[PDB]
A paper describes a structure:
The ΦC export signal was identified in studies of p24-family and ERGIC-53 proteins, and comprises a C-terminal signature of a pair of hydrophobic residues or a single terminal valine residue. The ΦC motif contacts a site on Sec24a that is also the binding site for the LxxLE- and DxE-class export motifs.
A series of ΦC-signal peptides was synthesized, based on a core sequence of yeast Emp24p, and individual peptides were soaked at high concentrations into two crystal forms of human COPII protein: one comprising Sec23a/Sec24a•Sec22b, the other Sec24c.
Residue numbers in the entry:
A (entry chain B): 348 to 464, 476 to 662, 666 to 882, 888 to 1093
B (entry chain A): 3 to 205, 225 to 464, 476 to 537, 541 to 723, 746 to 764
C (entry chain C): 1 to 23, 29 to 130, 148 to 157
């Protein structure tokens, strides 16, 4: 409850990881609350009225990771699904049992009857996260089979990248590991200026390539054997994946007809739906969906983003209608207009994957990144033809959604696919004053079809209290969740207005919030829950999404915004504010509880060069990547015992990973690195290339506390905030 | 001997005229009943003429440019020759500086009046063969077609170019080779494409047309793996078959890859077109394919719009110089009436059977690739026929497999016939049997036939044929002209006229008007006395040829399907005289114990019980067993060694049938019937106004009556 | 010429296996799910229903209903033989597990046998009543 003066601390970042706030609830109610990783709110203490919310100047909203992989999941198979007869809210641990045979709905307050099927001991009332077996009324059609369609760019530029070699090899290794049963269907399409289909029949000596050159009028050439059964045609698929990277070695096709290629891929998956994987390497220049080139901005252009055409938006809406999701793999070395291409994944519940300047021989970093990301992309669980409803207690109203989906009528989120790595955000307002209740509940119902052909409903329920004073609102503030919601709000501000407005609204979010806290209590005074608020916002303003005076290119910025709108809150925080450790002096204060493994726990350092040292090495955890920066004057012990090298001069320029040496210093750093990646499914690639002169030291671009020739330092920032707070 | 003269001129020059003495005045020229015409075979075979590797002598006259011929007056002292067409005198070329009266060039000996030169100058172009395969047919019919096309692959020259276009609902243009994927371009069979669009949508040899010696291995595997059209056929429906589009893509492909060079578009169909341009019938089985009765009562909506599509492709490819063959084998009609112009305007073949899985088709298909003594196909490509005549002769036109080049000159007549209005024609495909009918008008006499074409070896050749017929002596005009009349040639030449007007519409009225007129001028009679009418030996067979012509399937189209009538007319407009007389009037041999095989009359009186007949219609070999021999055969007298003579009787017509069952290119359907048998109908309909006796009596009453 | 196949338990209308291919489906799948509800142990074991331009066919064996939809011109003789081929295979594989399951479409993987058997009938190479009455 204490008040912090940010101008005297300058060391407020804790040495241990940040934990989400515990809502100020009763001991028996909070113990049943939802896991904060699956469901969390910006304000754990909900403001009673909208006037109190506007006074606090903090955004109210939710951030949910609904399909995340779980260690344990209760699966109810009851012959009936107990839902409130008014608002269809599933029975949750936060209802009110009165008559023992009647329960009060925590969202619409209507009393319901408990069916003849200790009722409070029912598993539907003892788990905030549960999964049902949906009855026959919860499906428009029989459960669709798992369908996978891969669409590859095979133009001359794509063949030069060499991406087809690694992509086809990963498919062969993970062919049995694809989610699905004996109903699984798989298909392939390549394209340059013409669309190439690939029929697969056991009666033929080899697969047959069928070309559609009528670009203005695509069609499906064959009624069968284009989408084939993977179980029956296993051998026929394996031959094509070994022959595909050899059919276009001498290709002189330069133009890519991506637009018409997606239309043919849509017509192919339109009957059944499923997941459509698209690999693209250059600008779409031929046919519908053609995009004009664009000159990249430099560090000398002001903030003067939006799609160039509505084609890929209109096309994604048709894919969503047929339960088809499009994942876009962009492996381009030049401009490709991702502001327009990304619409194919935003409005179809897909997800984009960006690999700048991918080359099989010239960029081994992007090669191993595509290797590990495809390992996750092909083996993670999946849901088909899915929808998600987000219900909140009466009085609260959702008014803006964030993520990759299509908002149907009556706030229904359409998800052609649902993947366990997708995060969403919701902004809401107090439509009616919460003077009646002291608790409010939020429930997200995820209806989907599993890979085994089963309609399942995953439900998460969160419970939060209601407060009526300014100080009680600031006390329950989640600073990490506020930064996540503001980043999503600023991304929409960029498209709607401009990038300058998106940056001004982010600074005004800190100004107005602390200006209101000051008007209700010399230096810069903040509550303890917001001691890191100006730090994470400055980090937001220096991320590749909103940075101004940098040499950033157009595709880098839009992908940094596609990750704001799509990644969970934790990895958004790891990207915006990476965790910096010193890893040349690992000791035994770690988590040596886990058997033989010791796992050192070095303290988190702040993102400033002042914290670095030329006498050692520093590891940085950016969520998707791990960078180890080696100082020039590093000790000979760390070079020989950890790097396996006799001097700083003989450290290989691109070092793809550390060697597992026969030294205890190697075991300590391998144990610490292993512990980092075990916390996440997406394997983060480590590269020790960061040197003091590798020309790849973007390691410094994450030093958000320090000043540059185009941004303020952390302390320069605090002086500007105080100047405006008491203006 | 006039008979000896007619026979020798056809053996040497490959020509047979209706009149061998021509009217020397404007009086008789306008009154000639049968026009002056010729049955000219540009590539007729003969006892080993030496291929003359010369350069044809060019007349110094610009308009004339006729080829040196034995009719040209030479002066071996002054080293000159006078062109017999324009009287222009010429200087002999340097290579002819040493020609003497004892050593003179071959083009001046009357034995070499018809001659062929070989012109070797430019690099030779390879032969091109484009297979167009229908996939909407039964497995047994598709399998046999696959084996036959694999057989023809092993007979092609190593340098020839080949391509594969399979079609069903879609059209696939296969890319050969490609090493391990076998790719192809797919197109909608619902809309037509021009050659310019197809060129842009696709991109010496091509990716689609590769030499045999490099691609035969993969093409044999591709053809061996061809399967049915994968689209299902719902109950009560026909397959969706896009014939009119696959042909326009085959035409369009060669049109933008190898224009103006010999190429064969070989299309194989197993049913009618049911989709896209060139549609013949709907897809519902309840609607029968159109018949002549449906044609006449306007119950066929796809005929006119279908024929127009195939006339456009016929003229497109014939302008480019490419040949379209049509191999049609199905149980129902297939639409030959709508597609007839493609093999007719070009020099393409037309094979019509019941199924591809028959000995009829398989053997007929390998006759197409029958080779000569030097192992070369008996087919020519890109023929250009130019006819040069005396200043007293004008050309009305030609009736046969040809296309007008629309070249004008003093030899073109205002009265055009068939494909007229020109003195130059293009025949994209010709064989040693291809016969044209050229009709001449009068406004010695000489005509020079110049035929430039591409040999099956790639050598560019020119066949020159110069002939001469006497002008009638003024004091013996109709007398000499009557003796020089060829009744067999005039019959087919006049029949060639009737089938043309019928196929491009009464016609029987014009036939009888000309037969009566010919009787009134060259017959002998007193007025109003029919019994006093007689005809000379020169004319005594002409009315009998007209009798079997007006009752034939060529003019009485009913009792046949529209495809069968178009097939009959197809082969008639191309054959020589010997085969044409067999079509109009089938020959008939008799086999009995009392005597060796003898030719007999085509009348119901020849049908005896104790005798075996062998009727040769050009399209049907029919063996008829009388009632007595049928009973003698149903009894079992043949197997007994007592009647080895009865075995000779039952197999004598079979032996004679096998010989002509192999030489004839459109292998005739073999029929073994007897009295009371079903297939005995074909014999009784060709046999017998009504009958010839009544037909002659009616003719004589009109010949001796008013003129 | 077109098919819509459903296998359901007659007692409660619980779906067991189906197969649908379009490239509407919403009106006749509804009308299919009413039949599964109206049918009981007094229903005709063999029947054919007229739905204007469409026509349903079903047989009932071992408390299991094998329903198929097709355009009215599809041969009635072939639709019943198609349902018999499905029943003879389904009763052998899952016939004993039918009365115990509780999930909808507990035999989706029967999808594979339906479509391969379906293709052998829509390629040419008992009671009758109006469906609107029963509904
Ligand atoms: Zn409720
Ligand atoms: Zn001359």
């Amino acid at each position: 409850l204490r008040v912090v003066n940010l101008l005297q601390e300058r060391n407020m970042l804790p040495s241990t990881p940040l934990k989400p706030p515990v809502p100020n609830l009763h001991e028996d109610i909070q113990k049943l609350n939802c896991n904060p990783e699956l469901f969390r709110c910006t304000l754990t203490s909900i403001p009673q009225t909208q006037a109190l919310l506007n006074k606090a100047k903090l955004p109210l909203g939710l951030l949910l990771h609904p399909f995340k992989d779980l260690v344990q999941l209760p699966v109810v198979t009851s012959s009936t699904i107990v839902r409130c007869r008014s608002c269809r809210t599933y029975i949750n641990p936060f209802v009110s049992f009165l008559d023992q045979r009647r329960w009060k709905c925590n969202l619409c307050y209507r009393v319901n009857d408990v069916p003849e099927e200790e009722p409070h001991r029912r598993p539907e009332v003892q788990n905030a996260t549960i999964e049902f077996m949906a009855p026959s009324e919860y499906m428009l059609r029989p459960p669709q089979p798992p369908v996978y369609l891969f669409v590859f760019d095979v133009s001359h530029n794509a063949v030069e990248t060499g991406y087809l070699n690694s992509v086809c090899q990963s498919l062969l290794d993970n062919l049995d590991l694809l989610p699905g049963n004996t109903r699984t269907k798989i298909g392939f399409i390549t394209f340059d200026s013409t669309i190439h289909f690939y029929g697969l029949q056991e009666s033929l000596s080899q697969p047959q390539m069928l070309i559609v050159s009528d670009i203005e009028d695509v069609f499906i050439p064959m009624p069968e054997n284009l989408l084939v059964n993977l179980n029956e045609s296993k051998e026929l698929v394996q031959d094509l994946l070994k022959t595909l990277p050899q059919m276009f070695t001498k290709t002189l096709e330069t133009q890519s007809a991506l637009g018409p290629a997606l239309q043919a891929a849509f017509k192919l998956m339109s009957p059944t739906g499923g997941r459509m994987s698209v690999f693209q390497t250059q600008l779409p220049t031929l046919g519908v969906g053609a995009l004009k080139p664009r000159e990249e901005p430099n560090h000398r252009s002001s903030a003067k983003m939006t799609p160039s055409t509505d084609f890929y938006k209109k096309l994604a809406l048709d894919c969503s209608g047929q339960q088809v999701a499009v994942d876009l793999f962009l492996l381009s070395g030049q401009y490709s207009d991702l502001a327009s291409l990304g619409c194919i994944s935003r409005y179809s519940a897909g997800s984009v994957y960006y690999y700048p300047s991918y080359h099989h021989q010239h960029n081994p970093v992007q090669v191993q990144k595509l290797q590990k990301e495809l390992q996750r992309y092909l083996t993670r669980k999946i849901g088909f033809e899915a929808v998600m409803r987000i219900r909140c207690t009466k009085g609260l109203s959702i008014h803006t959604f964030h993520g990759n989906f299509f908002v149907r009528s009556t706030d229904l989120l359409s998800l052609p696919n649902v993947n366990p790595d997708a995060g969403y955000a919701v902004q809401m307002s107090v439509e009616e004053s919460l003077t009646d209740t002291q608790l409010v509940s939020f429930q997200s119902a995820l209806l989907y079809t599993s890979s085994k052909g089963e309609r399942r409903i995953r439900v998460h329920t969160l419970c939060l209290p209601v407060v009526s004073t300014l100080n009680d609102v600031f006390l329950g503030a989640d600073v990490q969740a506020i930064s996540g919601l503001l980043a999503n709000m600023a991304v929409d501000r960029s498209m709607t207005a401009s990038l300058s407005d998106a940056r001004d609204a982010l600074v005004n979010a800190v100004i107005d919030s602390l200006s209101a806290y000051r008007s209700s209590v010399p230096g810069l005074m903040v509550p303890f829950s917001l001691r890191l608020f100006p730090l994470f916002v400055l980090a937001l303003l220096k991320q590749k999404s909103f940075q101004t005076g940098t040499n950033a290119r157009l595709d880098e910025r839009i992908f940094a915004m596609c990750q704001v709108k799509n990644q969970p809150l934790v990895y958004l925080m790891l990207t915006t504010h990476p965790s910096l450790y010193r890893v040349d002096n690992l000791s035994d204060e770690g988590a040596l509880n886990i058997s033989d493994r010791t796992i050192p726990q070095p303290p988190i350092l702040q993102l400033s060069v002042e914290k670095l040292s030329r006498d050692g090495a520093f590891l940085m955890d950016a969520g998707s990547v791990l960078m180890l920066w080696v100082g020039k004057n590093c000790t000979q012990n760390f070079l020989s015992q950890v790097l396996g090298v006799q001097n700083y001069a003989s450290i290989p320029q691109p070092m793809t990973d550390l060697p597992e040496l026969d030294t205890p210093e190697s075991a300590r750093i391998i144990a610490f690195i292993s512990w980092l990646r075990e916390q996440r499914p997406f394997f983060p690639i480590l590269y020790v290339i960061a040197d003091e002169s590798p020309m790849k030291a973007n390691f410094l671009q994450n030093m958000i506390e320090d000043r540059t020739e185009s941004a303020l330092s952390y302390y320069e920032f605090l002086l500007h905030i105080q100047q405006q707070v008491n203006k | 001997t006039y008979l000896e003269f007619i026979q020798q001129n056809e053996e040497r020059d490959g020509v047979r005229f209706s009149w061998n003495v021509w009217p020397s005045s404007r009086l008789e020229a306008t009154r000639m009943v049968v026009p002056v015409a010729a049955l000219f075979t540009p590539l007729k075979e003969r006892p080993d003429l030496p291929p003359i590797q010369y350069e044809p002598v060019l007349c110094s006259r610009t308009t004339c440019r006729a080829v040196l011929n034995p009719l040209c007056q030479v002066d071996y002292r002054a080293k000159l020759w006078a062109c017999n067409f324009c009287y222009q005198r010429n200087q002999f070329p340097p290579s002819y500086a040493g020609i003497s009266e004892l050593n003179q060039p071959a083009e001046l000996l009357p034995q070499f009046s018809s001659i062929e030169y070989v012109v070797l100058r430019g690099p030779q172009m390879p032969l091109i063969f484009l297979y167009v395969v229908d996939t909407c047919m039964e497995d047994e019919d598709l399998q046999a077609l696959k084996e036959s096309m694999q057989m023809s692959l092993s007979l092609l020259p190593p340098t020839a170019l080949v391509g594969l276009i399979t079609f069903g609902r879609m059209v696939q243009v296969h890319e050969l080779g490609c090493e391990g994927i076998s790719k192809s371009y797919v197109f909608r069979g619902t809309k037509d494409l021009s050659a310019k669009q197809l060129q842009e949508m696709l991109g010496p040899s091509n990716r689609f047309l590769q030499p045999v010696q490099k691609i035969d291995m993969n093409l044999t595997d591709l053809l061996g793996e061809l399967q049915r059209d994968p689209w299902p056929v719902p109950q009560g429906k026909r397959p969706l078959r896009s014939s009119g589009v696959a042909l326009s893509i085959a035409v369009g492909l060669l049109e933008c890859t190898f224009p103006n060079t010999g190429a064969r578009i070989m299309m194989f169909i197993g049913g009618p077109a049911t989709q896209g341009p060139g549609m013949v019938v709907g897809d519902e089985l309840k609607t029968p394919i159109r018949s002549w009765h449906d044609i006449d009562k306007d119950n066929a909506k796809y005929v006119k719009k279908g024929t127009k599509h195939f006339e456009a492709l016929a003229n497109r490819a014939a302008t480019t110089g490419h040949v379209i063959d049509i191999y049609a084998c199905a149980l129902d009609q297939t639409g030959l009436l709508e597609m007839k112009c493609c093999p007719n305007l070009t020099g393409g073949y037309m094979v019509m059977g019941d199924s591809f899985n028959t000995s009829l088709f398989k053997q007929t298909f390998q006759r197409v690739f029958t080779k000569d003594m030097h192992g070369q196909f008996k087919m020519g490509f890109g023929g250009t026929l130019e006819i040069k005549t005396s200043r007293e002769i004008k050309i009305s036109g030609a009736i046969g497999p040809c296309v007008s080049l629309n070249s004008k000159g003093p030899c073109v007549s205002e009265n055009e016939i068939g494909t007229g209005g020109t003195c130059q024609w293009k025949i994209c495909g010709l064989s040693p049997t291809t016969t044209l009918a050229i009709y001449f008008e009068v406004v010695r006499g000489a005509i020079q036939f110049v035929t430039q074409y591409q040999h099956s070896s790639g050598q560019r050749r020119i066949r020159v044929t110069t002939i001469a017929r006497n002008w009638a002596d003024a004091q013996t005009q109709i007398q000499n002209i009557a003796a020089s009349f060829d009744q067999e040639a005039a019959a087919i030449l006049m029949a060639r006229l009737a089938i043309y007007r019928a196929e491009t519409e009464d016609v029987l009225r014009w036939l009888d008007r000309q037969l009566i007129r010919l009787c009134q001028k060259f017959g002998e009679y007193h007025k109003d006395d029919p019994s006093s009418f007689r005809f000379s030996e020169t004319f005594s067979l002409y009315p009998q040829f007209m009798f079997h012509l007006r009752r034939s399937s060529f003019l009485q189209v009913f009792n046949n399907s529209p495809d069968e009538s178009s097939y009959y007319r197809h082969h008639f407009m191309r054959q020589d005289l010997t085969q044409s007389l067999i079509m109009i009037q089938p020959i008939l041999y008799a086999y009995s114990f009392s005597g060796p095989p003898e030719p007999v009359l085509l009348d119901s009186s020849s049908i005896l019980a104790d005798r075996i007949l062998l009727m040769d219609t050009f399209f049907q070999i029919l063996i008829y067993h009388g009632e007595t021999i049928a009973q003698w055969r149903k009894s079992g007298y043949q197997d007994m060694p007592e009647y080895e003579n009865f075995r000779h009787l039952l197999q004598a017509p079979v032996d004679d049938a096998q010989e002509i069952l192999h030489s004839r290119f459109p292998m005739p359907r073999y029929i073994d019937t007897e009295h009371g048998g079903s297939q005995a109908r074909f014999l009784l309909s060709k046999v017998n106004d009504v009958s010839l006796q009544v037909f002659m009596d009616h003719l004589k009453k009109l010949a001796v009556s008013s003129a | 010429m077109v098919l819509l196949t459903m296998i359901a338990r007659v007692a409660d209308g619980l779906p067991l296996a189906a197969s649908m291919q379009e490239d509407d489906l919403q009106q006749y799948q509804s009308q299919a799910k009413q039949l599964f509800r109206k049918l009981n142990e007094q229903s005709p074991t063999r029947c054919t229903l007229e739905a204007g331009a469409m026509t349903f066919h079903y047989i009932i064996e071992q408390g299991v209903c094998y329903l198929v939809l097709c355009e009215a011109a599809f041969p009635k003789k072939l639709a019943f033989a198609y349902l018999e081929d499905l029943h003879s295979e389904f009763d052998e594989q899952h016939g004993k597990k039918v009365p115990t399951v509780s999930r909808p479409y507990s035999f989706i993987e029967f999808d594979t046998f339906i479509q391969k058997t379906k293709k052998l009938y829509i390629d040419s190479r008992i009671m009758v009543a109006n469906i609107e009455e029963v509904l």
